[PDB]
Write a protein that binds this DNA or RNA. Structure first.
Lengths: 106, 141, 22, 50, 36
RNA sequence: AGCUUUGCGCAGUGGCAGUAUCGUAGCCAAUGAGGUCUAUCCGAGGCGCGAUUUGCUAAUUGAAAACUUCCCAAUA
RNA sequence: AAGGUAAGUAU
RNA sequence: UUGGAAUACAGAGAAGAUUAGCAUGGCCCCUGCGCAAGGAUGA
């Protein structure tokens, strides 16, 4: 149900950014957070009509070393008002969900 | 002996307060030659070494910078405004004016506790925060 | 003895009307 | 020696057995045994037994 | 460092001595006297 | 050729892992660390400082524990 | 007289 | 399945919490792998 996420699946090292202000989070904020040279992702979940972000975004990088570096590099420090939180993206696709359901037997 | 940094110009204090990141900017308004303000400056100097990591103290002179006297109603000695995160915090300590500490603290540890509580409140994002010790009474008895 | 489901009004986060729907 | 900045407490990312071993080694297991509950009715001790 | 440099400290002390004339200046005029 | 002594790294089990342990860009060092037993002497660092990886998953509280459409009049 | 301004969020 | 409705907002933590288990790492016994190497025996 998320074709864009499939296009975003190219970069493996995906981090979940949380505690984002509705107006605080922006593309410029992601660019300022794009310390590593690898291509980032500024996509953040937001309201369909008003565009008010729920505070959760995902940043994808092709460098797991940059992932590890940024895990402790930008924990608690963010340019805007609301301080940033970083979590290991436990994101799953429908195929992974079906595989987990099948393997839940043992 | 009042060796803390002092704002020679009013606009310098403005940009100094603006140039803050994850720190609390304690701007102590008043005059160094006042005796109660001298005691407050001595207390701030004593605190400065212990809490310099997140608490920065930056004094200013009302005569040197009178433009901010009317901004926050600066008409008393020993006034302290915890202008942190570019937001004037609401520090409530059992007083009518819960945004200004206008008397020298009796003990340094009390001021350290107050400033760390202010830092916690500012980091949490709330614009108001209470004090563990109410100052409605001076505990004179 | 029977008991149908009980409905409720969604006053919170409702921009449809100022007054709660009935 | 400046005092450390009181950052907001962060819980353990993943509770480990070694972390559980530290919890087993150090914790409030003995304090939990001593119940601080007080009966609504009066106790047999005096007002200021202490 | 947190504290101001030596020049700033000297300037602050000179200003304090010039303003507070109780313990500075030729004569003790007043606490807030511009000229002692 | 078999076998044995021993250590490092790795692999497996077991074991301890807040009197448990490393880190140190500090510091005394086999040219001799450091002794209060032994001072033609024992021989190992002494004692500071900085602290106690990563990953899986459950459970609890709360209205909500954060993974990229509601509702309305009737109907297909 | 008072010691009795919740903060937050864009308008 | 159409179309649209979608001062104010929210409100004392939501700037997503609390507690707990297993594995690994580290440590160390045993054993194994890689491997330095000497020692003696036998046809």
């Amino acid at each position: 149900e998320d074709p864009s996420l499939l296009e975003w699946d190219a970069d493996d090292f995906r981090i979940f950014c949380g505690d984002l202000g509705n107006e605080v989070n922006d593309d410029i904020l992601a660019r300022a957070f794009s310390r590593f040279p690898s291509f980032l992702k500024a996509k953040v979940i937001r309201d369909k009509r008003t565009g008010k972000t729920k505070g959760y975004g995902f940043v994808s990088f092709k460098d797991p070393s940059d992932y590890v570096r940024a895990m402790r590099e930008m924990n608690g420090k963010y340019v805007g008002s609301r301080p940033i939180k970083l979590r290991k993206s436990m994101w799953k696709d429908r195929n992974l969900d079906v595989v987990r359901k099948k393997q839940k037997e043992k | 002996s009042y060796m803390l940094p002092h704002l020679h110009n009013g606009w310098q204090v403005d940009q100094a307060i603006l140039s803050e990141e994850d720190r609390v900017v304690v701007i102590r308004f008043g005059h160094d030659w006042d005796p109660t303000c001298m005691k407050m400056d001595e207390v701030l100097y004593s605190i400065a070494e212990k809490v310099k990591n997140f608490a920065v103290i930056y004094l200013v002179d009302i005569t040197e910078v009178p433009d901010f006297n009317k901004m926050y109603e600066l008409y008393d000695p020993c006034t302290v405004m915890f202008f942190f995160r570019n937001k004037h915090i609401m520090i409530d300590l059992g007083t009518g004016n819960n945004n200004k500490i206008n008397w020298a603290m009796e003990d340094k540890q009390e001021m350290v506790d107050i400033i760390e509580t202010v830092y916690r409140g500012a980091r949490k994002g709330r614009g108001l925060v209470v004090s563990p010790k109410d100052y409605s009474t001076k505990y004179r008895y | 003895n029977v008991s149908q489901k009980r409905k409720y009004r969604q006053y919170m986060n409702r921009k449809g009307g100022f007054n709660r729907p009935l | 020696k400046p005092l450390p900045a009181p950052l907001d407490g962060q819980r353990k990312k993943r509770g480990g057995r070694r972390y559980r071993k530290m919890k087993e080694r150090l914790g409030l297991t003995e304090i939990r045994k001593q119940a601080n509950r007080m009966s609504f009715g009066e106790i047999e001790e005096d007002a200021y037994q202490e | 460092e947190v504290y101001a440099p030596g020049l700033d400290i000297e300037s602050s002390l000179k200003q304090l001595a010039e303003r507070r004339t109780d313990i500075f200046g030729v004569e003790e005029t007043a606490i807030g006297k511009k000229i002692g």
